[PDB]
């Protein structure tokens, strides 16, 4: 499903793409060059300007280790 499970032996990080596709009608802040693969993103990113950045910037998403990584 939309859910785009990433890689992380520390606990997959189910990213409600769909939900995120609704909460962030602007498929740009997440998609640079455009909708699809992203060049630059990674781990640190998610832990910052990528997933958390918005989470900590917006204060809606998960912003804790036990708020993303869920075995």
Letters for 24-43 (x = contact with ligand HEM by CB under 6 A, - = none) are: x--x-xxx---xxxx--xxx
Nearer to ligand HEM, 1 or 65 (CB): 65
Cα-Cα end-to-end distance for the chain: 19
Q: Which of 3, 32, 48, 58 binds ligand HEM (CB under 6 A)?
A: 58
* CB 33 to ligand HEM: min, Å: 12
Calpha distance 55→59 (Å, rounded): 5
The candidate with the shortest Cα–Cα distance to 60, out of 27, 11, 22, 7, is 22
């Amino acid at each position: 499903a939309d859910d785009i499970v990433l890689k992380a032996k520390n606990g997959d990080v189910k990213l409600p793409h769909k939900a995120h596709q609704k909460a962030v009608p602007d498929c740009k802040k997440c998609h640079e060059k455009g909708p699809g693969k992203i060049e630059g993103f990674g781990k640190e990113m998610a832990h910052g300007k990528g997933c958390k950045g918005c989470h900590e910037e917006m204060k809606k998403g998960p912003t804790k280790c036990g708020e993303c990584h869920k075995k």
